[PDB]
Design a protein around this ligand. Structure first.
Ligand SMILES: Cc1nccnc1-c1nn2c(=O)cc(-c3ccc(C4CCCCC4)cc3)[nH]c2c1C(=O)N1CC(CF)C1
Length: 210
């Protein structure tokens, strides 16, 4: 009834997220490989109990339990990615959000290994007023070197099951806050598996409940 149908709330919706590489010869004929992708351009999610994923993220001072405790609970999501690691340039990420409200956002991504934080990236994004709605675009950001390096390490593992073993202990926690009020707008826990070499990237979005 008031349960989300996609990744977002009534205040802030994800429009698109992509992690990609454009090969050097994209200048001659354009092409790009999507490692992971979410697109909600053209439209109730199933749920997962947040307690079962606590141990995949840090456990104090910005941990998932402390964040979920502050709320609001309807802003929390889990995204499972099947990553397309069959490729082979410029490694990039792009994200876009929309809202009916004019806000300044702080977007934080915390990369975790074995449930502990290893790198964090934070950027603020001001709104652009477009067709009645406000849009928040961060396009073609250079991929952080930690994950460019990680992608290259993963690609050279000899077995899909070893890749999945490694990614079992790798997660990303994304928190989008109103920069002016410090209110949380969206929190998404990302977990990862490798897609079969013949299948491209896919995702499954869940509501997080407690
Ligand atoms: C530009 C930015 N500004 C503010 C806050 N966050 C970001 C950001 N930077 N960034 C990076 O530099 C690399 C990845 C990235 C790269 C690779 C992969 C996987 C690794 C495992 C194998 C398949 C590819 C996932 C994410 N993702 C991201 C995100 C950003 O939005 N993110 C939303 C979160 C989604 F995970 C990250």
């Amino acid at each position: 009834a008031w349960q989300a149908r996609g990744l977002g709330t009534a205040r802030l919706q994800l429009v698109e997220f992509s992690a990609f590489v454009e090969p050097p010869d994209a200048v001659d004929s354009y092409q790009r490989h999507l490692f992971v992708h979410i697109s909600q351009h053209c439209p109730p999610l199933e749920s997962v109990d947040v307690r079962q994923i606590y141990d995949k993220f840090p456990e104090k001072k910005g941990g998932l339990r402390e964040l979920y405790d502050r709320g609001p609970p309807h802003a929390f999501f889990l995204v499972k990615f099947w990553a397309d690691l069959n490729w082979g340039g410029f490694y990039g990420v792009s994200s876009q959000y929309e809202s009916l409200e004019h806000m300044t956002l702080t977007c934080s991504s915390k990369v975790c290994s074995f449930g502990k934080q290893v790198v964090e990236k934070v950027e603020t994004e001001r709104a652009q007023l477009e067709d009645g709605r406000f849009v928040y675009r961060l396009l073609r950001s250079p991929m952080c070197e930690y994950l460019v390096n990680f992608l290259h390490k993963l690609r050279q593992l000899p077995e899909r099951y070893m890749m999945n073993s490694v990614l079992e202990n790798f997660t990303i926690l994304q928190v989008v806050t109103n920069r002016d009020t410090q209110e949380l707008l969206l929190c998404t826990a990302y977990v990862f598996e490798v897609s079969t070499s013949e299948r491209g990237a896919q995702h499954h979005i869940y509501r997080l409940v407690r």
